[PDB]
A paper describes a structure:
Most ComEC orthologues are comprised of three domains: an OB fold encoded near the N-terminus, a central competence domain consisting of a bundle of transmembrane helices forming a channel and a C-terminal β-lactamase-like domain. In the next step, a single strand of the tDNA is translocated across the cytoplasmic membrane, which is mediated by the putative channel protein ComEC, while the non-translocating strand is degraded.
We determined the 1.8 Å crystal structure of BLACTMg, consisting of the characteristic αβ/βα fold that defines the MBL superfamily. Our structure contains clear density for a phosphate ion in the active site, but lacks coordinated metal ions and thus represents an inactive state. While our structure of BLACTMg does not contain the β-CASP domain, it does display common sequence motifs found in other MBL enzymes, such as the characteristic H-X-H-X-D-H motif (where X is any residue), which consists of H598-X-D600-X-D602-H603 in BLACTMg. BLACTMg contains no bound Mn2+ without specific supplementation of the metal (as captured by our crystal structure), whereas the majority of the molecules in our sample are coordinated with two Mn2+ ions when BLACTMg was incubated with 5 mM MnCl2. The absence of coordinated Mn2+ ions prevents the active site from adopting a fully catalytically competent conformation. Based on the catalytic mechanisms of those family members and structural predictions of BLACTMg coordinated by Mn2+ ions and bound to adenosine monophosphate, we propose that D602, H603, and D600 rotate into the catalytic centre to coordinate metal ions. Taken together, BLACTMg coordinates two Mn2+ in its catalytic centre in order to function as a DNA nuclease. Mutation of most residues involved in metal coordination render BLACTMg virtually inactive in our nuclease activity assay, with the only exception being D600A that showed a ∼5 fold reduction in the apparent initial rate compared to WT.
Author numbering: 532 to 797
The structure:
């Protein structure tokens, strides 16, 4: 019954979220995403794996690759090459999406690392005190299975009264679907999708999340103007503090399931 500790690693314009669970399990959600820095600097080798060593991690129980487009795998390649990984979770892979993932999945097979496709209604049993629910995407052969950002994996991490919604890169169309299907998205902490892009502004969905604080992993002087002013304005309208990795470095959230705290690096 150690506290849950979640670190949003400062990986620039990218997401990498390390969760140390109460029982002592190690979970990594993403590893920096698509290299907009042309990949010459591998954020996985240079930032993520060294971070995990500095936190004392020697193996990861679960690695989650949230995005169905394989050129978003990014630093996760370096993670599975740089330390033992017991399980990789990916979204439902279909069509050309599976195609592009095939080299990564072949490396997993060569390493003996099982992978699991996860979709709406699944859960990642890892720690008996943590409920890790997969809310999105569904598995239906539906319209635009190929709609990449909107079919990224959404996870809700629950420890008693504390919850964290890891929204990956979803946009307003996915948010409307989640709202329409009654997804239980109300959360203590909301990870804003796709670095605060304005295309994640779905007010009915965000009203239901009703977060106490939000976290934006986002890079300084990224090419997209992230986080969008419309997104920052929205959280101001709601009175919700915004934590950002570009301005504040790594963001650390700790909780015993009743009390929780957010701290920053810079």
């Amino acid at each position: 019954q150690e506290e849950l500790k979640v670190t949003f690693i400062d990986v620039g314009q990218g997401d990498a979220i390390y969760l140390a669970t109460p029982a002592g399990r190690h979970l990594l959600v993403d590893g920096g995403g698509r290299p907009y820095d042309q990949g010459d600097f591998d954020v996985g080798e240079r930032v993520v794996v060294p971070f995990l060593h500095r936190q004392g991690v020697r193996h990861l129980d679960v690695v989650v690759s949230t995005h169905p487009d394989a050129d978003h795998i990014g630093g996760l390649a370096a993670v599975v090459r740089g330390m033992p990984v017991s399980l990789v979770v990916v979204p439902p892979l279909r069509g050309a999406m599976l195609d592009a993932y095939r080299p990564f999945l072949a490396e997993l097979q060569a390493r003996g690392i099982p992978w699991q496709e996860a979709g709406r209604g699944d859960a990642l049993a890892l720690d008996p005190d943590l409920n890790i629910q997969v809310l999105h995407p569904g598995r239906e052969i539906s319209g635009s299975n190929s709609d990449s950002n909107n079919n990224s994996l959404v996870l809700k991490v629950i420890y008693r009264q504390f919850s964290l919604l890891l929204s990956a890169d979803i946009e307003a169309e996915a948010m409307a679907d989640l709202k329409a299907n009654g997804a239980d998205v109300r959360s203590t902490v909301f990870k804003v999708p796709h670095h605060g892009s304005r295309y994640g502004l779905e007010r009915e969905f965000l009203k239901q999340v009703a977060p106490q604080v939000v976290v934006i992993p986002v890079g300084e002087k990224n090419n997209f103007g992230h986080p969008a002013p419309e997104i920052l304005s929205y959280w101001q309208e709601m009175g919700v503090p915004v934590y950002r990795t570009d301005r504040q470095g790594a963001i650390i959230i700790k909780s015993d399931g009743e009390r929780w705290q957010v701290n920053t690096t810079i």
